[PDB]
Amino acid sequence: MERKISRIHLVSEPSITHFLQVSWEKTLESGFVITLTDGHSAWTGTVSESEISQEADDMAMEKGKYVGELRKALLSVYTFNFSKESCYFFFEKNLKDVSFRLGSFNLEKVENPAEVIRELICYCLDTIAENQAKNEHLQKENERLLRDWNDVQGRFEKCVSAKEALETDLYKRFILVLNEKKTKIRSLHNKLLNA
Amino acid sequence: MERKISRIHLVSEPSITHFLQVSWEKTLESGFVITLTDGHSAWTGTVSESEISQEADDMAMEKGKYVGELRKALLSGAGPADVYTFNFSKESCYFFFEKNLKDVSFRLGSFNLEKVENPAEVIRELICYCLDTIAENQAKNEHLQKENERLLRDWNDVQGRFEKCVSAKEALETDLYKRFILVLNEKKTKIRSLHNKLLNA
Amino acid sequence: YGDSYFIDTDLNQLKEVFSGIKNSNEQTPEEMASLIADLEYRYSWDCSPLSMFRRHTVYLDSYAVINDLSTKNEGTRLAIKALELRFHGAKVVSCLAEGVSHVIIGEDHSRVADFKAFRRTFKRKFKILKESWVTDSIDKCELQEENQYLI
Known part of the structure; x- marks a missing residue:
């Protein structure tokens, strides 16, 4: 796979930081290629397992954490010390009761x-x-969504207000004619009482 | 801010080629700092108004936007489509780009x-x-896409609510009509009965 | 009006009479909403799934700030929650009031603690109802339950 730059900061030389542009091939112990640079000179290393894979098989391969160790070892964490002269990158792993080497x-x-x-x-x-530019893409997306939401919320205000006004006016007219009916029935009941 | 690296392959050295990462100084008529790097090495410089004027006049240009041409040359606000031969002879330590104006590759820098x-x-x-x-x-997508999800969900919500509200307004019109007319006609029927028994009274 | 004296129930007659009767807003939408709910209780019309919150005003956290007008969450559904409240007559207030028993939080429902504090301040305590409590107020076109969410 394509050599992707994983920038790393050496504890020996943090000023001119390195860039572990590691093109790991599906693993870090049975075939991988690491192209390391400090940004100035490119140590494009088509590396093999004849130089690191023995680090596994020689120094107590136990049963706790190795894949994550090497994975974090290729990013910015241990005492990353790449030797410029020997084109060799090493660092020390630190943990409880013992500090092994890793890479x-x-x-x-x-x-x-x-x-x-x-x-x-x-x-x-x-x-x-x-x-920002595909901000602008998904932004015409969310802007058509925003205009849709604004128009539909405006019409939501309009429909709620129209419902309220319709209920109000219907109830006003009903109240008026119901007062008419109630006055009529009360007067008629009074006429009943008189007779 | 957009310190756009104009990826240019030198006609002198395309392998060790230079990359025009400038930091233009404002008021380009007053000057600016040319900084240029080939990765393997680098070459920064300073440009005075004498060079600015000579390069402005090289393209037979009078009283205009040559400062804009230099702005688009230094940090390449426009992409490589702006045809400036950003050929820096690192052997000569002299940087020069040319604007093909008036059918001549006139010296733009x-x-x-x-x-x-x-x-x-x-x-x-x-x-x-x-x-x-x-x-x-292409990553603030997440940002205005958080916004996009918010607007999608809220717009669908409002569309549903507005449809239900217009349906509910029509239903309210008809059901209020029914209820109010029921009340009035029940009052009228009570009036009918009261008048009938008044005739009996 | 155009209404007669001795006619029984139909539908078109009320349309004609209400056309005859005036069309004026004698009362404000909130006060007449309260009266609409009053007549809805009187004639058992409050069972209508169209407007039943018409009596009590209902607070909404339609804003990034509680009890303040200093902001407005645009691109959100909060004013939409306000319209959903108002559709049933639940009058929306930006500031918590003691006449409020239903409260709907913004899009993010982390404003519960300040709502409880204001319940301590506002003696008539309000139940802390999430947004869905008012989204379904129209989504189902029916009032939701205060017990659905935090009290």
């Missing part, structure tokens, strides 16, 4: 140091496609 | 860059502009 990433270097940088510029392009 | 002390600093600048990228043209 022996011997990340080879290609002659082109701008490969990861030009890939990071394609990355500035799509990352640039990460907030 | 001739910027005397200088070798950076350490490319790492401008690389950090490039990767923080990269975070601004990461928030620039």
